Amino acid sequence: AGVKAYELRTKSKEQLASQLVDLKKELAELKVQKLSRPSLPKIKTVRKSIACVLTVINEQQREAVRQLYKGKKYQPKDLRAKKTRALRRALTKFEASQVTEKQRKKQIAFPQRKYAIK
Amino acid sequence: AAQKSFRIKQKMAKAKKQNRPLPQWIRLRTNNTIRYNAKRRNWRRTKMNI
Amino acid sequence: AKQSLDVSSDRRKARKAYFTAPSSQRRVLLSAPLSKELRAQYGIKALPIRRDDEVLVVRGSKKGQEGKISSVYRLKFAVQVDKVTKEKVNGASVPINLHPSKLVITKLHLDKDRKALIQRKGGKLE
Amino acid sequence: AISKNLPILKNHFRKHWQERVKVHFDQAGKKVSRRNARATRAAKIAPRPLDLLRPVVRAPTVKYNRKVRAGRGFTLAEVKAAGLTAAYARTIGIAVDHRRQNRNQEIFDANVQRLKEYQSKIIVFPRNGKAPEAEQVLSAAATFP
Amino acid sequence: NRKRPVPKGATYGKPTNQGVNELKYQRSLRATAEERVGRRAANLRVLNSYWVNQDSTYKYFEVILVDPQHKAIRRDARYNWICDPVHKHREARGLTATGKKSRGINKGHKFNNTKAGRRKTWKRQNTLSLWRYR
Amino acid sequence: EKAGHQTSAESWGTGRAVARIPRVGGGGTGRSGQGAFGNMCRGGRMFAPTKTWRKWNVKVNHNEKRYATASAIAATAVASLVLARGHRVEKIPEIPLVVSTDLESIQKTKEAVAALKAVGAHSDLLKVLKSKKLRAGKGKYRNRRWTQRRGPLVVYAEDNGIVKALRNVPGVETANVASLNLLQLAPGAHLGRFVIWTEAAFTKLD
RNA sequence: AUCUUGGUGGUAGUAGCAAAUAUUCAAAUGAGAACUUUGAAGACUGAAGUGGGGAAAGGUUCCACGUCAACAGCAGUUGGACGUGGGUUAGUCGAUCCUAAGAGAUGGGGAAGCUCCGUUUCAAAGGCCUGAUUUUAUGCAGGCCACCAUCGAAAGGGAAUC
RNA sequence: GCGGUUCUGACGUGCAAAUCGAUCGUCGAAUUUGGGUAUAGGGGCGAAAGACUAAUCGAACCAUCUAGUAGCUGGUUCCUG
RNA sequence: GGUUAUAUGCCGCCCGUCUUGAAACACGGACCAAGGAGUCUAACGUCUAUGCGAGUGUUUGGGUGUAAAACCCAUACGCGU
RNA sequence: UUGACCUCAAAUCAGGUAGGAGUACCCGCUGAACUUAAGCAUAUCAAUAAGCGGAGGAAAAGAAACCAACCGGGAUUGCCUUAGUAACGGCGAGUGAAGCGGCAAAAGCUCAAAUUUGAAAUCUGGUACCUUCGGUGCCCGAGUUGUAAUUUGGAGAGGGCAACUUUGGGGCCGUUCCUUGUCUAUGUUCCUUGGAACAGGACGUCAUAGAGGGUGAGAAUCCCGUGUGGCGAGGAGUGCGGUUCUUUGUAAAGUGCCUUCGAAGAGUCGAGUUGUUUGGGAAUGCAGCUCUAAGUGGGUGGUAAAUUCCAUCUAAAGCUAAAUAUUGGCGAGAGACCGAUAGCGAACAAGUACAGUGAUGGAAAGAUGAAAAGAACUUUGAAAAGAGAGUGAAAAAGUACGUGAA
RNA sequence: AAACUUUCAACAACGGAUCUCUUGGUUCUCGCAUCGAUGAAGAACGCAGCGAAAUGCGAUACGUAAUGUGAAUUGCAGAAUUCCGUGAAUCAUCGAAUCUUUGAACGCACAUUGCGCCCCUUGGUAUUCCAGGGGGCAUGCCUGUUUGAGCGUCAUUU
Numbered sequence A: 001a002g003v004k005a006y007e008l009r010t011k012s013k014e015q016l017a018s019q020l021v022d023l024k025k026e027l028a029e030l031k032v033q034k035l036s037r038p039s040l041p042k043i044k045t046v047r048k049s050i051a052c053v054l055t056v057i058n059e060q061q062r063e064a065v066r067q068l069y070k071g072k073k074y075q076p077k078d079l080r081a082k083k084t085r086a087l088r089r090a091l092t093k094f095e096a097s098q099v100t101e102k103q104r105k106k107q108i109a110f111p112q113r114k115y116a117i118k
Numbered sequence B: 001a002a003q004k005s006f007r008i009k010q011k012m013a014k015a016k017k018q019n020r021p022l023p024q025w026i027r028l029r030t031n032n033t034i035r036y037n038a039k040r041r042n043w044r045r046t047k048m049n050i
Numbered sequence C: 001a002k003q004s005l006d007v008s009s010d011r012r013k014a015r016k017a018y019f020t021a022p023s024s025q026r027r028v029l030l031s032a033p034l035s036k037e038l039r040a041q042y043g044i045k046a047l048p049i050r051r052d053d054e055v056l057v058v059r060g061s062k063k064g065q066e067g068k069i070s071s072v073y074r075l076k077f078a079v080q081v082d083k084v085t086k087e088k089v090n091g092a093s094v095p096i097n098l099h100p101s102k103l104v105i106t107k108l109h110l111d112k113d114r115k116a117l118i119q120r121k122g123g124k125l126e
Numbered sequence D: 001a002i003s004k005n006l007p008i009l010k011n012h013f014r015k016h017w018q019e020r021v022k023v024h025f026d027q028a029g030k031k032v033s034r035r036n037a038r039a040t041r042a043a044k045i046a047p048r049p050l051d052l053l054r055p056v057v058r059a060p061t062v063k064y065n066r067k068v069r070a071g072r073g074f075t076l077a078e079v080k081a082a083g084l085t086a087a088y089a090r091t092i093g094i095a096v097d098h099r100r101q102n103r104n105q106e107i108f109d110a111n112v113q114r115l116k117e118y119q120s121k122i123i124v125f126p127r128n129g130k131a132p133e134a135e136q137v138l139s140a141a142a143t144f145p
Numbered sequence E: 001n002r003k004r005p006v007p008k009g010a011t012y013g014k015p016t017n018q019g020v021n022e023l024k025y026q027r028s029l030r031a032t033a034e035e036r037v038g039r040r041a042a043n044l045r046v047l048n049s050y051w052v053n054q055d056s057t058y059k060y061f062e063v064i065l066v067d068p069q070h071k072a073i074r075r076d077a078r079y080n081w082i083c084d085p086v087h088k089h090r091e092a093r094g095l096t097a098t099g100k101k102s103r104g105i106n107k108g109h110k111f112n113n114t115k116a117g118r119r120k121t122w123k124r125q126n127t128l129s130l131w132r133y134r
Numbered sequence F: 001e002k003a004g005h006q007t008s009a010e011s012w013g014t015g016r017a018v019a020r021i022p023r024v025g026g027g028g029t030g031r032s033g034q035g036a037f038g039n040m041c042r043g044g045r046m047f048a049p050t051k052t053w054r055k056w057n058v059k060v061n062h063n064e065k066r067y068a069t070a071s072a073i074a075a076t077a078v079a080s081l082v083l084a085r086g087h088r089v090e091k092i093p094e095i096p097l098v099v100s101t102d103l104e105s106i107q108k109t110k111e112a113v114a115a116l117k118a119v120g121a122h123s124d125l126l127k128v129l130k131s132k133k134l135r136a137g138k139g140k141y142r143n144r145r146w147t148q149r150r151g152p153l154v155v156y157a158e159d160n161g162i163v164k165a166l167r168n169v170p171g172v173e174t175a176n177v178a179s180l181n182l183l184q185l186a187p188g189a190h191l192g193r194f195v196i197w198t199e200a201a202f203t204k205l206d
Numbered sequence G: 001a002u003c004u005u006g007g008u009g010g011u012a013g014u015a016g017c018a019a020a021u022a023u024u025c026a027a028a029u030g031a032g033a034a035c036u037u038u039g040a041a042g043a044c045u046g047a048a049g050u051g052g053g054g055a056a057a058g059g060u061u062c063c064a065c066g067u068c069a070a071c072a073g074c075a076g077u078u079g080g081a082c083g084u085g086g087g088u089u090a091g092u093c094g095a096u097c098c099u100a101a102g103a104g105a106u107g108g109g110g111a112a113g114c115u116c117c118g119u120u121u122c123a124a125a126g127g128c129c130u131g132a133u134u135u136u137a138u139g140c141a142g143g144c145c146a147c148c149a150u151c152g153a154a155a156g157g158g159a160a161u162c
Numbered sequence H: 001g002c003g004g005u006u007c008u009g010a011c012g013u014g015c016a017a018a019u020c021g022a023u024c025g026u027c028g029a030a031u032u033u034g035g036g037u038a039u040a041g042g043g044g045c046g047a048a049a050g051a052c053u054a055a056u057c058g059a060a061c062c063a064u065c066u067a068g069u070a071g072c073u074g075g076u077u078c079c080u081g
Numbered sequence I: 001g002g003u004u005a006u007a008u009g010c011c012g013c014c015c016g017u018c019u020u021g022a023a024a025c026a027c028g029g030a031c032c033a034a035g036g037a038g039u040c041u042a043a044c045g046u047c048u049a050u051g052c053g054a055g056u057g058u059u060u061g062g063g064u065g066u067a068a069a070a071c072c073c074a075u076a077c078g079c080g081u
Numbered sequence J: 001u002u003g004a005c006c007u008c009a010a011a012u013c014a015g016g017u018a019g020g021a022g023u024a025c026c027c028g029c030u031g032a033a034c035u036u037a038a039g040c041a042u043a044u045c046a047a048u049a050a051g052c053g054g055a056g057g058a059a060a061a062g063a064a065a066c067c068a069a070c071c072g073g074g075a076u077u078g079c080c081u082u083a084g085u086a087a088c089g090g091c092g093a094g095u096g097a098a099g100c101g102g103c104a105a106a107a108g109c110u111c112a113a114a115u116u117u118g119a120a121a122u123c124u125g126g127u128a129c130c131u132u133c134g135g136u137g138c139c140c141g142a143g144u145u146g147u148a149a150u151u152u153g154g155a156g157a158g159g160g161c162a163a164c165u166u167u168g169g170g171g172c173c174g175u176u177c178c179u180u181g182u183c184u185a186u187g188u189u190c191c192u193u194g195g196a197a198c199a200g201g202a203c204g205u206c207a208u209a210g211a212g213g214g215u216g217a218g219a220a221u222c223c224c225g226u227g228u229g230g231c232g233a234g235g236a237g238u239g240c241g242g243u244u245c246u247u248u249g250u251a252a253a254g255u256g257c258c259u260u261c262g263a264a265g266a267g268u269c270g271a272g273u274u275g276u277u278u279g280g281g282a283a284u285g286c287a288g289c290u291c292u293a294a295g296u297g298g299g300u301g302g303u304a305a306a307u308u309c310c311a312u313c314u315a316a317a318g319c320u321a322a323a324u325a326u327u328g329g330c331g332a333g334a335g336a337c338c339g340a341u342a343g344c345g346a347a348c349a350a351g352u353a354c355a356g357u358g359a360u361g362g363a364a365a366g367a368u369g370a371a372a373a374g375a376a377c378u379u380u381g382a383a384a385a386g387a388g389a390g391u392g393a394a395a396a397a398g399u400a401c402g403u404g405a406a
Numbered sequence K: 001a002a003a004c005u006u007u008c009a010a011c012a013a014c015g016g017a018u019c020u021c022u023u024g025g026u027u028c029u030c031g032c033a034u035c036g037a038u039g040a041a042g043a044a045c046g047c048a049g050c051g052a053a054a055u056g057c058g059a060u061a062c063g064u065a066a067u068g069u070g071a072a073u074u075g076c077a078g079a080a081u082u083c084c085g086u087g088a089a090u091c092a093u094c095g096a097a098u099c100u101u102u103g104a105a106c107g108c109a110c111a112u113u114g115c116g117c118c119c120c121u122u123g124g125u126a127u128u129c130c131a132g133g134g135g136g137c138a139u140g141c142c143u144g145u146u147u148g149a150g151c152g153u154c155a156u157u158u
């Protein structure tokens, strides 16, 4: 059938590591059997289980690190948002919104007015 | 060429694996138009140029 | 006549969109009309065909034959009914490919999702 | 290459002119876009008109000084005479131009008249609330010909 | 001057183009200065430059640069224009003061060739415009 | 612009017992040595490649367009011409055929079709239905698959339904009387379109 | 258009398939044997070989089993062909290390610039020894010397196998 | 081994886009040669023939400018009046 | 009587091309299919048709639209007077 | 001796940043020749190709050291005009702009030069905390060789007098804008032909839907869509319409009169000369070298010079949407376009196979049938195959597959 | 007379024209603005029950996670038909990951699968040797930190 990642997300770090090894053992066993038999398609299910478990392990370990840098200025580049190189170099909303005191005063004194012709 | 680089040997290994006729079951596939292996190479016909 | 600037009347584009339709899109392309019996019951003209729907053939050489949809061969844009078959000279029996627009569904294979679809189209269910 | 009694011609096609031919097939398309953009702008700016009020000026040169036409903007002097500051006027739909000078009482008086007629025929909404439904007139140029 | 960099003074063409000596680069020594500095400090933006000195062999300039990554510049409303990426390598495109001089970007009858961009102007004047209704 | 010239072909010159056309260089493929560039070569450039700056649209003096439109309108009121142009107006009583202004406010196709049959446009509608044919030639590949006759032109003064109600009837055009179109009044440059005027449109003509 | 691409003739069953001394008998195999295999015979290369190994180059051609449509300018049961597999084992043999003619970063200087020069220079150009301390394998304790990256040989130099 | 004199031999739709046979020059050095390395196109290299520089040389090869220009050669497609 | 094949009488050089002169001992053509060469554009001359006429030209643009169409239009500008 | 300062270094020091790609359009640099002139050198091709550097969704330009000479206009760009004109030119071939006028789009502004001097009022970083595109404390640092506030020539500043006017910043809910999902008519009724009805005939139905496509032949009505309208989901953004919280004000801005002032960019401008370039002609711009200013000054006013006026701007510092470009990228819609020797080189495992040491060069090649129903079985043959039989509407459709010319 | 040669027809060849077709091209219009040191474009080598390609992907390898759909995929094999469901699929979508060796390409090199050094850790009697696992070490430039250099230079104190 295969493992299901919603079931794995309940599990602990150690339980998952243990399961990962049981799958790696199982996969080896089938690689041997494949030599004898003509066709052996069960091996696909266990390849994908391994890949599932590693995905979940990595998710857990990353979310742990996201918590460790909660709120801190500077976090690992791999947890920073990707966007694009050019977007990451752009001025922030704050920087782009800055006006000098001279211009702030003019903007208050003389905003564009709403008006209509009759 | 007895004493050869790994890089050359790796390319030769690739060439070994590709040197085969088309698997017959491809011909049975729905809407198949591949008749034969059109990129087959032979040591007597065409050189690999490394 | 079309009015929307998003829709195309280009033949070439239409044919491309059909022949390269992915499996999901082909589901909708392979709809069949309900029988006039079932049209009363559910209040729906047509549905996407499904394995284990029962069917009547209403056009072609096998017009009149009935059976269950044994397979929806979306890749071939066709359905295979069990019992509609070709007796081959060697004695083997291959399925005939029928297009769902030439069938009529006489019994639906229902389930939570099919039921939800029927009520979604303003059907009745009972 | 010269023969018969024909005009001498001056067809300048000795450069690689076919690299730079612009056929205006987008004429109809550019007109639909321009119109959509007027509509879009009108909606963003509503109820304001799409144009600023502009002064009358005399065209220069002996060939066209018999005509008057719309100029760039009111003078600082005309805006002051109409009972208005440049900074305010800019915000109430009046084009102001610091470069143009008044040396002619007829054009000056006519421009001051324009500004008075304009301040009569607009309604400036207060910068808070209450805002009464005015209805958008798109052209100051058609209102104040 | 800029000596034409051709082997042994051979030019391989018509006599008008046989010059090698007495030719002159179309940008100023000031612009060369900004450009070479600009390449040494590619994280910075060249703002402007000025003459300080000369001998027979060299002219000396000082080039003012701004760091667009420094938060003192990014948060300054008067200077953060230079952070926008249109202003990358302004010295290389002729957009500094010395650049605009050498490109002939000025108003009036003396700058008809150049005021809008020499190449743009040329292209506009050598375009055949055909309407649908000719 | 690049078709036919994506080749480094050069003439071999005389002395090789071949024609002096440019030839593809190199070796090891069927294309090597073959004729190139010229209009007579397989794979070469067409003679005088078509260019986009051919004159496409044509200017016509406005006052001449108006003349033709007025002639076209005048001919709509001559039953001889309307018959000759293939309209089935044998059993209509009177051309010009004017009908009530009520036509302008019909909302449903079913109703608008009944009105056209009522006033004697049945045969001309039928003609359009029976005339659908697949187009001869490569036009079929180019989004012009079917062909059929033109039906009546219904002319109104104000559209309060009628354009949408006639949109789907094969061959029926509609038109505001303010903006009459020579391409509808004289299809194929043949005078005598069958026109059904509303009373309001007919008064507006003056 | 000695036109372009493709196809097809006559020529014609014609020119021809004649260098390197050379083949023969029997059996086996097989639908079929001048040509495959075995045996018998006759000859040749004649050790500056048609023998036994390698370098460059090739890249699986090596070996087995199956096997003949095409290819081996006759043939073919045979094959460097076709199909399917098997096969290359290192502390000691090479590479790897060293420098050669040379190539080439850096410091610098040229050049609008792609880049060019130059190779230890008009540079603040490093990295070892020993004890400890027992805090530790980093600062500390001492000392010591300072030349100038790097690449460049499967025939040069070179740790070690029969 | 390196060369290439004569037969003006073979061949001359070849075994071969330079070969074959015989005859011949030289054969311990201004010798022959492998590999590494340097020199690049108005450039190199040359015991010098305008030789050689990948079957290309009194200026290589590749692409582009380029559909270069041609007072010159060839061609230029249905009928009747 | 037509058609067609053949026979008989008389007649009939191979086309294309350049050329004063080609059947030429002038050139291209072994054969067959398919492709294959005065085009489009800017500005013009004469002539003709058409509209309006001391004027004329709606289409840069604006308005409108059943939306690259059709329909409507101010100020200029061009040519003319 | 101890501690500064200045200048210069080092570190796998803390945190960042550049490079390469694409390259249609855009900003520069560099820069040909073929070609034309019936020869050819100046000229032309061309301020083009090739080469190099640098950007963006646009770029650049841009709020006059402008145009003018008028009754004056008023940033830039683009279109129509100006105009094949003024002018340049072996005054040959050829080349060739600008002002005004009509339009599209429209938007304006910032520094330097000033004593906060009764208060460096300013800012990076680290650190703790928080409501985190950031905020608040605290601490080092930068900075007086000058960071803030104030002013930019249209002005404006300092004093003095007199008056009235106008304001900030949050959430929350609609609309907007984009990206998506889903629901929303009517015959598979009869006859004929056919392998198949989607054909013909008959009788209907829907139509704001008779666009288009599919299905065994020309299908509005068999299927998907189309038309109309409804209902969801996810963002983005205050653009602006409502509501709610906090009211910034001893603050900020605007305005009249009097008075004293009014800082305004140098190896620049300008000049000579050299080269290049321009329609720019005793010199249009650019650049090298030499010379090198002024402050009622300086520039321009398309014939050099002196003298006298006048007119017009305010250089040598800076930012800025839109109208404009676009053989590239992404997403769409179309065509009197081509229809497999055509159209992109490429309808196909095509920039592939293949050639070349390399740069590079670079093909051919689409169609059985509705459906494989792709010929069981028999027989001759070593076999390939034949002959039958069969499948199919047809093998005069057998994969050497539509038609099947010469 | 036959053969032979030639001409025409029928049937059969050869060959692939013609006709009909078209998920391709071409041109015009409209809208949009998004590559890269957070490792791009491009390259190499790999990966499927049975593939040589094309296409997809990276030792988690024709994919993993998430979301939507609601039962396939299909050449065969196999699996599954609690499929009235946290659920089929070469499905759509896509926000989380994985992403060999490379490449601007960054420890030094590269016709080498060549040779280093540093930190943490495990094993072998181990600070120093050998091995395994993890994580690091390019250049220019900016701001800052720290450690310094120079009779450049001030004060102070010998």
Ligand SMILES: [K+]
Binding pocket: E011, E012, E013, J032
């Ligand atoms: K040259």
Ligand SMILES: [K+]
Binding pocket: E015, E016, E017
């Ligand atoms: K010259």
Ligand SMILES: [K+]
Binding pocket: F005, F006, F007, F008, F009
């Ligand atoms: K070419």
Ligand SMILES: [K+]
Binding pocket: none
């Ligand atoms: K070894």
Ligand SMILES: [K+]
Binding pocket: G153
């Ligand atoms: K060695």
Ligand SMILES: [K+]
Binding pocket: H042
């Ligand atoms: K030379």
Ligand SMILES: [K+]
Binding pocket: H054
């Ligand atoms: K070569």
Ligand SMILES: [K+]
Binding pocket: none
């Ligand atoms: K040359």
Ligand SMILES: [K+]
Binding pocket: H071
């Ligand atoms: K001549």
Ligand SMILES: [K+]
Binding pocket: none
């Ligand atoms: K006869």
Ligand SMILES: [K+]
Binding pocket: I017, I018, I027
């Ligand atoms: K001739």
Ligand SMILES: [K+]
Binding pocket: none
């Ligand atoms: K001759």
Ligand SMILES: [K+]
Binding pocket: none
């Ligand atoms: K760095």
Ligand SMILES: [K+]
Binding pocket: E014, E016, J043
């Ligand atoms: K010249």
Ligand SMILES: [K+]
Binding pocket: E113, J097, J278, J279
């Ligand atoms: K000019």
Ligand SMILES: [K+]
Binding pocket: J283
């Ligand atoms: K000059």
